[PDB]
């Protein structure tokens, strides 16, 4: 099973993809990045946003 996110765990629940094509993680669990609902438009992760 592939792992994802800042937390390095398997996919679960809703996930969000980072819009930096060079992102090293790519997919994140909503709660790990402080989200309850889908943001509109492009989104970048905390490592990409700084």
């Amino acid at each position: 099973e592939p792992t994802y996110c800042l937390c390095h765990q398997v996919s679960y629940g809703e996930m969000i993809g980072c819009d930096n094509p060079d992102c090293s993680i790519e997919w994140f669990h909503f709660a790990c990045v402080g989200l309850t609902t889908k943001p509109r438009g492009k989104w970048f992760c905390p490592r990409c946003s700084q």
Binding site: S11, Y12, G13, E14, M15, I16, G17, D19, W27, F30, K38, P39, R40, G41, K42, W43
Partner: peptide
């Protein structure tokens, strides 16, 4: 944003 359900 792009999202998926597991």
């Amino acid at each position: 944003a792009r999202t998926k359900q597991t």
